Write a protein that binds this ligand. Structure first.
Ligand code: CYC
Ligand code: CYC
Ligand code: CYC
Ligand code: CYC
Ligand code: CYC
Ligand code: CYC
Ligand code: CYC
Ligand code: CYC
Ligand code: CYC
Ligand code: CYC
Lengths: 69, 162, 206, 172, 162, 172, 162, 163, 172
């Protein structure tokens, strides 16, 4: 985090894809329904768990942008 | 800002379920309280200027050592700001009465209150005394119910300011 | 009727947690004002800090302001809360690591630990990758993610059957919660001693 | 966590009979007295800073050790906790007042406060005296009839007194 | 249990605040509408036997096929337990009227009704036509606001059964 | 948890020796009967709702005080929790049958039930009667030969009976 | 409390790792800066009574009206409490200098002071003026490193007050 | 708390709040049918343990000649006894994982925390890697049919863990 | 959590009086020798892998009951936990040495470790022996004066040995 390699936070735009919604229905609505598209800001170190978890959830990454560098 | 039906909307959307009775009786509560607040708003619209001026004179009264030269009460533009402040507070009070809720009052004055108060040496007790005096004259200005909910709403404004 | 009377919620109040089961979860979804904001923060602070009262000076203004704008989810705000030094000073600093993990489970997951194997694994995780990784593991855990969600304030999900929860979780959290009045500061010596270790021990063997 | 009607329903279902006309009459009378009870609750809510402040003043006048070095409330953090505990117990008592019965305190507020205060080292009798003076100040404010429909809320005053009394008893 | 009074007190306790205007206005609403609600509950308690037994008859008339030997509805104990269940429903509708909230229904019969119903292959419709019988009678036994609100609560009962 | 093969490996590790030939013989005996185990668990799972429903029928028939008001099944939410309890106990006994080692039932299920139902006020004797009624209802489908190759499986009957007896004596 | 060595120990605990040259350098510099801080502690300790009396009379000079009857300052017990509070503050500032940090001061005054402020109406500006006088007074009681570090401690306390 | 196919199935089913569907039954059937070659391999390895351990000792000696000279870690009679004991326990746990039809025994017994053991005892994995290399070379004839590959899978997983 | 300076300030608050000039001089003397203490703890941390290696080797040479199956540290995971246990014990002893007070070691390793090991079945006397061996290796490594100015550090040696003594007495 504090490290120069820990910095360079990147923003992520996330779309709750159709496959994501189909998986969500079978798993169950334990979270409130929000509009499929939403934005998010993620540091470098926890950048990985974000798209990993989106991959098990079935969603796909719209794009990636860098806050720093 | 919320009217009672506004938090009704918020909840009903939040659980993703239709309105049950309870919020509907709340809607009543609002409607049957609406009219007394309506003539309250009328009366306070009538009395505004005297309210402001008398409040200025009384806040000078109970705190005379701020009217002395060299502090906040001293200053022509200072007193003009006192007057405009009182006007704004009681106008938002009328707004809240019309809404039958504290919503506009909250999101228009209450947010960031304390830090503004000590960030400019504007004593909260000044506005506490001003609002208390306003209770003093509005006790006779309004009668019956309208007096009661006016008392309660400026009381809530004081409690947030206190 | 029966000679022995069983009220509707009788189990809720004979067990120390009745209002806990009655108290609903709180979420922060759409733009809002200071009033229910302050209420939500008060509820969060009672939740995370085991009914330890946090001095008004200690709280972080920047994090709550960013949450108010909404750029950071409530999950991120909970991360920032746990990472704050006051969390360690109340919890991590005066208490042993087994007791620390028990408290961490009870607070940020609202449930008792399942088996001593979980405690051992999480102690190993702490030893291998520091303190902050344990909190990141809890709040990144799939169990929390599904049971609460991105926008859910943690609540005591014990005192209630859960999908795939150990039978001893109920007993441990009954022994561990012990009421609204229970505090977990550097005082009372209850937040320091690992009560749950004895119960966790019996689950290792059969 | 139950109010008057809810608990009435509670033992009603316990006995397995319908709500007898007498109990309905009692509840209807309560609701008729409802606006007075709400008036008392509003009076409690309004004067909360005043009552907390002045009750603290009498407490710390009649005891000094709590503010003395090493006293059970010597540091500013501990003084603040000392005051907010009384604020919370007052808020819960007002909760019970509007609820008509003392279920809320026994359910959550005071089920296990005694062990917490032993573990914290707080003396119980001091807390009991603080609750008692809180009660006295609340009574003084409620007896005031300014800007309210005059009448007889003797039941309400006595009933809030019973709240505070059993709260102090639960402290012990 | 679960009442508008209880909703107020819980939604003030979990945030640790003292009560302010909106919820105490809702309390006014509750305390004013208690009297029509409580007299409606009184009337329902006054006429229970006809309601329950005629509801059983109405279920038979709307489902003759459950009456014959060899199916689940057949049996003296089965009719007794019919009357028991419908009596419970009338019970809890009266309770909800008394509480001026749909709480007790939700706490007792609405919590988990689906899986217990499919546990014994119970058809919720049967109870729905029992409720239809009940609304048919309360269209006569009550008058106006008490009638309106009893209809509201029973309608919510079907809706939950729906 | 700790299955039968896990149990054998556990004892081998504890005494620090290899597998004896008799150990491999008994583990092969377990391996060959796995088809019969599959048949048994399929029978239990498929008939589970019917079994639990009729078992609850005999339950509430035999003890009529539980259902009626003031009983622990009355408020009809407790009924839902009761059905959940029957299904979960049958689920873990099916688990234990499949594994062939009662460790999973003892640890994952029966460790805390005793204190749990003390804290819940449930008559535990009633729950023991309940699980006994479960075994009575389930042995029917157990000896059912519908749609499957026929064969004596007396060991499976006895093992299921012992599993249910362990559960009963636990909650007893 | 929060001393440099204490926070180093805590953070070393955090990442589950031993100490390194950087934090030992921090402890080093703490040890050397202790000696001027130790002399500052001596100078403040030997002057404590004059410090307290001068601060009290400086606050009185700035706001003599507070001493008027019916106000907080009026009353010999009130003045004694003023002096006792200022003495507690000075002692905690000595503890801050000894501890080479704000730890004890933060924990024992700054934790939960504004709550009492609001409850008991104890204006921070009074203690701010007292600490400003202590600043001016230690400007001559101390010089060099000790004066600068004591000044930064007390102005940290002032900024916390405001 | 071992992880075997049936135990993993049970844990998954318990986690999901459900019973066992078709896939669990099919997996149980597969494990039960594969147990017979695994038991065959376990018995065959049990028969010839001494040859395996001795050949492993000499293979480790021949691969790295720089060891068994005095003045280093491996030289010593107690060191030789420890070599024999370690190789014996390795083959013990390999047989255990063969019987369990899962790597859980090996993982929990040795692979759990092995790396800190090595770095606290200067034991580079390469010696035991060569030991298991000789072990698979010897078992390349010891078993037959399915048992051969059943042994191969678990021993290869153990080697990869050692890597 | 608390060090010598914090502990002294705590007593000063307990009596409510300023720090005594004598105790201020004591703290000044402690701070003067702080460079020697920092050198001691640095010698601890560089030799910490060496200290733990030596202690583990000698303990395993003297005790063999753990390396065999059925020993408390027999499996790789168990003995790895054992190794990190001694590692953390030494780490907390070093922390106490930095603080000069045993409060932090009490807060971390000596509040409830005993019953923790009892539940785990860990024999405490083995832990105490490991503490003694680490203490011997540590006094050996710090009594050397490599690349650092020589001086009288017998006070630091005594303090570290006594900290190990309190740790050992706590565990066993
Ligand atoms: C912060 C204070 C503190 C520390 C550091 C601590 C260490 C510690 N040791 C543990 C178990 C253990 N501890 C040991 C150590 C034993 N091995 C040998 O045989 C000796 C008899 C002895 C060491 C000389 C072992 C082997 C285990 C694993 C128990 C098992 O799996 O059977 C555990 C719980 C399970 C785990 O982490 O895997 C902890 C937390 N506990 C604490 O409360
Ligand atoms: C769970 C079952 C188990 C395993 C897997 C095991 C391996 C093992 N071998 C050890 C020591 C040792 N092991 C060896 C064997 C070496 N000699 C060389 O030729 C080779 C590199 C290698 C074998 C081919 C030696 C020489 C030592 C002594 C290390 C020392 O004390 O310096 C140790 C440290 C314990 C002690 O020092 O007494 C372990 C844990 N022990 C077990 O109880
Ligand atoms: C890990 C698997 C698991 C078990 C073993 C389990 C037992 C269990 N039953 C419970 C409640 C209950 N259980 C029952 C059922 C019993 N009472 C009646 O007398 C019946 C005869 C009898 C059914 C056999 C009832 C009625 C309650 C509600 C008690 C109350 O709310 O006061 C509870 C409290 C929380 C809840 O589940 O709602 C547990 C933990 N729960 C689990 O998640
Ligand atoms: C559910 C409602 C509720 C209760 C029942 C409650 C009791 C309570 N009192 C606490 C501390 C305290 N409570 C008091 C108050 C008492 N001690 C003094 O001697 C007085 C005699 C007396 C007040 C008049 C004090 C002084 C502390 C400070 C002790 C400490 O936290 O270190 C704490 C720890 C909270 C924290 O700081 O994180 C709790 C939970 N708090 C609540 O939110
Ligand atoms: C939105 C908030 C709101 C409030 C609070 C409010 C007060 C209020 N007080 C009322 C009557 C009353 N109020 C009181 C209570 C007061 N009299 C004395 O007893 C006590 C000093 C004091 C109790 C704290 C009494 C006794 C009555 C007359 C009822 C009766 O005699 O049965 C009524 C019913 C109409 C009336 O008779 O005036 C209202 C609406 N109105 C509002 O719109
Ligand atoms: C809190 C209120 C409450 C509810 C909601 C409730 C549902 C309920 N109704 C029951 C009886 C029952 N009720 C019915 C259905 C009725 N009888 C049939 O003749 C008609 C078709 C129908 C009337 C329209 C049946 C079929 C059973 C028992 C199931 C059986 O024995 O087969 C049972 C016990 C099941 C049994 O004894 O086997 C429950 C849990 N119980 C309650 O105490
Ligand atoms: C997909 C999961 C799966 C299932 C469901 C399964 C059942 C199963 N059981 C079989 C043989 C058998 N099954 C059974 C067990 C049954 N016979 C006894 O009489 C009882 C009624 C009952 C056990 C309580 C027996 C005894 C055999 C004959 C095997 C022998 O010689 O012992 C067979 C081989 C015959 C065929 O394919 O038609 C299958 C497929 N196998 C599977 O892989
Ligand atoms: C951690 C140690 C600690 C401190 C320092 C502390 C301050 C403190 N001073 C108090 C009283 C007081 N404090 C003051 C001083 C202020 N009022 C003004 O008049 C002056 C201009 C100004 C002085 C600069 C006075 C006059 C009183 C008595 C009247 C009152 O309560 O406000 C009180 C209220 C309780 C009482 O004594 O009656 C507190 C909490 N409390 C503590 O636990
Ligand atoms: C953490 C404890 C610490 C502090 C607080 C600190 C500040 C500091 N700066 C110093 C020299 C100085 N300080 C300054 C900066 C100041 N002078 C200029 O006029 C500006 C108005 C102003 C900058 C805003 C300058 C220019 C010097 C002399 C240059 C030199 O360092 O040789 C001195 C030596 C004189 C003395 O004993 O007071 C100190 C202590 N050093 C420390 O180790
Ligand atoms: C990054 C942390 C750090 C280190 C490591 C460090 C080493 C260090 N040790 C010093 C003195 C010293 N260091 C020691 C300690 C050593 N001598 C004894 O023989 C022991 C074997 C051993 C400690 C166990 C002693 C006794 C002195 C002499 C005291 C003095 O010079 O004032 C000095 C002062 C050199 C001088 O005054 O000319 C330094 C810089 N300084 C630091 O800021």
């Amino acid at each position: 985090a504090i490290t120069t390699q820990g910095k360079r936070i990147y923003k992520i735009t996330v779309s709750e894809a159709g496959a994501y919604a189909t998986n969500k229905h079978r798993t169950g609505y334990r979270a409130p329904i929000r509009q499929s598209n939403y934005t998010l800001t993620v540091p470098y170190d926890r950048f990985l768990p974000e798209m990993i978890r989106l991959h098990q959830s079935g969603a796909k990454i719209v794009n990636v942008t860098s806050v720093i560098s | 800002s919320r009217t009672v039906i506004t938090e009704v909307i918020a909840t009903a959307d939040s659980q993703g379920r239709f309105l049950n009775s309870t919020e509907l009786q709340a809607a009543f509560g609002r409607f049957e309280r609406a009219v007394p607040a309506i003539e309250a708003a009328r009366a306070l619209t009538k009395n505004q200027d005297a309210l402001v001026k008398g409040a200025v004179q009384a806040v000078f009264k109970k705190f005379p050592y701020v009217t002395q030269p060299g502090e906040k009460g001293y200053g022509d533009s200072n007193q003009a700001k006192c007057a405009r402040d009182i006007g704004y507070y009681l106008r938002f009070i009328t707004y809240s009465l019309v809404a039958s809720g504290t919503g506009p009052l909250d999101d228009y004055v209450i947010a960031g209150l304390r830090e503004v108060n000590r960030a400019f040496n504007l004593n909260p007790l000044w506005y506490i005394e001003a609002l208390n005096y306003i209770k003093g004259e509005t006790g006779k200005l309004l009668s019956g119910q309208s007096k009661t909910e006016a008392l309660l709403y400026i009381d809530h404004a004081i409690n947030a300011l206190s | 009727p029966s000679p022995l009377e069983q009220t509707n919620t009788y189990g809720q109040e004979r067990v120390q947690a009745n209002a806990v089961l009655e108290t609903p979860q709180v979420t922060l979804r759409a733009p809002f004002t200071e009033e229910q904001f302050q209420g939500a923060l008060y509820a969060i602070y009672k939740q995370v800090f085991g009914n330890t009262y946090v001095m008004e000076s200690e709280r972080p203004a920047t994090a709550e302001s960013q949450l108010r704008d909404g750029r950071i989810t409530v999950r991120g705000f909970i991360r920032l809360l746990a990472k704050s030094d006051t969390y360690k000073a109340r919890f991590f600093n005066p208490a042993t690591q087994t007791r620390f993990i028990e408290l961490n489970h009870k607070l940020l997951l609202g449930r008792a630990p399942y088996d001593q194997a979980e405690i051992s694994r999480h102690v190993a995780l702490y030893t291998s990758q520091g303190y902050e990784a344990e909190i990141d593991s809890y709040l990144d855990s799939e169990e929390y993610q599904e049971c609460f969600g991105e926008d859910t304030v943690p609540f005591f999900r014990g005192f209630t059957s859960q999908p795939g929860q150990s039978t001893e979780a109920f007993n441990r959290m009954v022994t561990l919660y012990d009421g609204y009045a229970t505090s977990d500061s550097e005082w009372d010596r209850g937040g320091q001693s690992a009560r749950l270790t004895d119960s966790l021990a019996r689950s290792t063997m059969d | 966590m139950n109010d008057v009607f809810t608990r009435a329903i509670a033992q009603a279902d316990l006995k397995g009979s319908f709500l007898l006309e007498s109990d309905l009459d009692k509840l209807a009378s309560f609701a008729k007295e409802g606006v007075k009870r709400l008036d008392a609750v509003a009076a409690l809510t309004n004067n909360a800073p005043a009552i907390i402040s002045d009750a603290a003043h009498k407490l710390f006048a009649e005891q000094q050790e709590l503010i003395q070095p090493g006293g059970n409330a010597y540091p500013h953090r501990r003084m603040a906790a000392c005051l907010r505990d009384m604020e919370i117990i007052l808020r819960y008592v007002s909760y019970a007042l509007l609820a008509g019965d003392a279920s809320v305190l026994d359910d959550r507020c005071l089920n296990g406060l005694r062990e917490t205060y032993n573990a914290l080292g707080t003396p119980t009798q001091s807390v009991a005296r603080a609750v008692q003076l809180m009660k006295d100040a609340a009574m003084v404010h409620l007896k005031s009839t300014a800007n309210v429909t005059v009448g007889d809320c003797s039941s309400l005053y006595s009933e809030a007194a019973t709240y505070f009394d059993k709260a102090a008893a639960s402290i012990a």
